[PDB]
């Protein structure tokens, strides 16, 4: 059984990575320039793009790549590090509004995770939560188009 979404972890911080097109992607503000661990020693990032808050290593063992969205849809779903699914309406190229705002803690640690369209395909990586007073009401995300061109 392979996973598309790996739950990763720095000494000082914990987030997610999403595997898309054979790359294991995640957020720069979490990984930095770090290497991803492997049973054969540290592996270096294939891609670093501090501009778009994006790094990518080769996909690890026990992973399955996600397919890039072509649905064009505006009804996304955010998957949290607890495997919760959060419906999000899309507002812009890289912005979307929760259908039911959750406490900020609910979305915590779930950046680098996928935003999926109705077909399950990747629309983007959850990048940062937009809060009013501790209540996440919307999210920033790196649209998958960015990943595809970064390659």
């Amino acid at each position: 059984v392979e996973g598309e979404v790996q739950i990763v972890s720095t000494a000082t911080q914990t987030f997610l990575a999403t595997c898309i097109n054979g790359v294991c992607w995640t957020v720069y503000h979490g990984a930095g320039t770090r290497t991803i661990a492997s049973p054969k020693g540290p592996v270096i990032q294939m891609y670093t793009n501090v501009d778009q808050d994006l790094v990518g290593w080769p996909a690890p063992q026990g992973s399955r790549s996600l397919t890039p969205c072509t649905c064009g849809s505006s009804d996304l779903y955010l998957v949290t590090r607890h495997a919760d699914v959060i419906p999000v309406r899309r507002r812009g190229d890289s912005r979307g509004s929760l259908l039911s705002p959750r406490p900020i803690s609910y979305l915590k640690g779930s950046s680098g995770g996928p935003l999926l369209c109705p077909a399950g395909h990747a629309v983007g990586l959850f990048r940062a939560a937009v809060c009013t007073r501790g209540v996440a009401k919307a999210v920033d995300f790196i649209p998958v188009e960015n990943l595809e061109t970064t390659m």
């Binding site: 000494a11 914990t14 999926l116 399950g120």
Partner: peptide
């Protein structure tokens, strides 16, 4: 330091 994988999520819900 280095990023380590501490768990995995399968979107399809597929059982082992």
């Amino acid at each position: 330091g280095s990023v380590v994988i501490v768990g995995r999520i399968v979107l399809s819900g597929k059982p082992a």
